[PDB]
């Protein structure tokens, strides 16, 4: 007869975007047996050829992109002090005690790469010539009220000093997403920009100095942008849900591991 809602959820888990089949008068067991055989063969092809994870391979492809363009690869701690978040302009219980994974009474999981990269910009200005170009790829954490990934991988590149203009920032974003093969559109008039993909925010870039720069020893012009790698993988592979691209035991490269 007709497929139930739970049976449809099960088949959608085993359903790849490349599959060109409709959910045909066949029973649920026949459809499930077909998708199971396809997903098993898909993993067999990965285990015999590529064997690289989508998240890891994307980090390596992005790293080669910015290293080739004069950006220094940064690997800052994931466990940051709480004082870094208090210095970002967040206190009370608006966003400090709501979307922050605190570990000890002093440390917490970093929700963004900006505080660590800001400290690197201050220290590297004493040794490196102008301009200072750095970037980092790493995990970030934010709770939830909303609906998004709590454990995700962030990319943050930034430049300080000369050439920190909106035109230069958009040229880097354009060359970056065209390199990967991701359609986008820049939205902006707030002194900030939004890199959108239809209705999904890929990145939120910041141009020019910010009054908050004084609290981080920053007194030069700077540009930067932060991309979520799980959101990028969802767009490139046309995943219906972003959880197929995140760190999980339930999916490998958008393929279900519950076979
Ligand atoms: Na602006």
Curated annotation (Swiss-Prot):
Gene Ontology biological-process annotations: tRNA aminoacylation for protein translation
Gene Ontology molecular function: any one: ATP binding
Catalytic activity: tRNA(Pyl) + L-pyrrolysine + ATP = L-pyrrolysyl-tRNA(Pyl) + AMP + diphosphate
Transmembrane segments: none
GO cellular component, one term: cytoplasm
Main subcellular location of this protein, as a coarse class: cytoplasm
Location(s), subcellular: Cytoplasm
Keyword annotations of the record: Aminoacyl-tRNA synthetase, ATP-binding, Cytoplasm, Ligase, Nucleotide-binding, Protein biosynthesis
Keyword rRNA-binding: no
E.C. designation(s): 6.1.1.26
Function: Catalyzes the attachment of pyrrolysine to tRNA(Pyl). Pyrrolysine is a lysine derivative encoded by the termination codon UAG.
Family: Belongs to the class-II aminoacyl-tRNA synthetase family.
Descriptive protein name: Pyrrolysine--tRNA ligase
Originating organism: Methanosarcina mazei (strain ATCC BAA-159 / DSM 3647 / Goe1 / Go1 / JCM 11833 / OCM 88) (Methanosarcina frisia)
Upper classification of the organism: Archaea, Methanobacteriati, Methanobacteriota, Stenosarchaea group, Methanomicrobia
């Amino acid at each position: 007869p007709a497929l139930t809602k739970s049976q449809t959820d099960r088949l959608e888990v085993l359903l790849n975007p490349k599959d060109e089949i409709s959910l045909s008068g066949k029973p649920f067991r026949e459809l499930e047996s077909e998708l199971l055989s396809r997903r098993k063969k898909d993993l067999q092809q990965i285990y015999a050829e590529e064997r690289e994870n989508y998240l890891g391979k994307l980090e390596r492809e992005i790293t080669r992109f910015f290293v080739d363009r004069g950006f220094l690869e940064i690997k800052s701690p994931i466990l940051i002090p709480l004082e870094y978040i208090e210095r970002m302009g967040i206190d009370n219980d608006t966003e400090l005690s709501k979307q922050i994974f605190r570990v000890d009474k002093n440390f917490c999981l970093r929700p963004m790469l900006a505080p660590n990269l800001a400290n690197y910009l201050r220290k590297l200005d004493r040794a490196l010539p102008d301009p200072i170009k750095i970037f980092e790829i790493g995990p970030c954490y934010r709770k939830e009220g909303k609906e998004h990934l709590e454990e995700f991988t962030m990319l943050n590149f930034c430049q300080m000093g000369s050439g920190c203009t909106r035109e230069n920032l958009e040229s880097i974003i354009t060359d970056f997403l065209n390199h990967l093969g991701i359609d986008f559109k820049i939205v902006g008039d707030g002194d900030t920009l939004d890199v959108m993909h239809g209705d999904l925010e890929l990145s939120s870039a910041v141009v020019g100095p910010i009054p908050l720069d004084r609290e981080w020893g920053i007194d030069k012009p700077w540009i930067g942008a932060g991309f979520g790698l799980e959101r990028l993988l969802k767009v490139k592979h046309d995943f219906k849900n972003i959880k197929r691209a995140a760190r999980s035991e339930s999916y490998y490269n958008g393929i279900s591991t519950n076979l």
